[PDB]
Amino acid sequence: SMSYDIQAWKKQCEELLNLIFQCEDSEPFRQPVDLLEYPDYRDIIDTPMDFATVRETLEAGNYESPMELCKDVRLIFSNSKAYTPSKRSRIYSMSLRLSAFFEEHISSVLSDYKSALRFHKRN
Numbered sequence: 001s002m003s004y005d006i007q008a009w010k011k012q013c014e015e016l017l018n019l020i021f022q023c024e025d026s027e028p029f030r031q032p033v034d035l036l037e038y039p040d041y042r043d044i045i046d047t048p049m050d051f052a053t054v055r056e057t058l059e060a061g062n063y064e065s066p067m068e069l070c071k072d073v074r075l076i077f078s079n080s081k082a083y084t085p086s087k088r089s090r091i092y093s094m095s096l097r098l099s100a101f102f103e104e105h106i107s108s109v110l111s112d113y114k115s116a117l118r119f120h121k122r123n
């Protein structure tokens with residue numbers, strides 16, 4: 001059970017997603033972009049991603065690890081940098097703040113999970 005629990009990352013990521021939805025900085029990134037308002041979004045972005053999608057994928061049981069979750073969240077940020085490239089944009093700034101918040105918090109979730117992995121593989 002609790003030390004080196006390889007399932008513990010799920011509730012941790014659920015809690016982090018909760019913090020992210022609270023942050024005013026996540027507002028542009030909560031829901032999928034709308035095609036008909038930004039008709040060019042798909043001209044620029046190959047693989048859309050948003051935090052409601054990540055939260056539903058996690059709820060569905062479709063991430064095998066926290067690294068898979070982290071990949072999808074990092075796609076949100078990389079997509080924002082491609083679509084809104086200008087450092088003058090407030091949206092750019094928001095993206096950067098929220099990325100840094102995510103990367104701070106996910107850090108321990110990842111390290112703990114990989115520790116757990118390393119322990120159970122060794123024993």
Ligand SMILES: Cc1ccccc1NC(N)=S
Pocket residue numbers: 028029033038041076079080081083084091
């Ligand atoms: C932040 C934003 C607002 C409106 C339209 C597009 C975007 N960019 C992404 N969601 S990647």
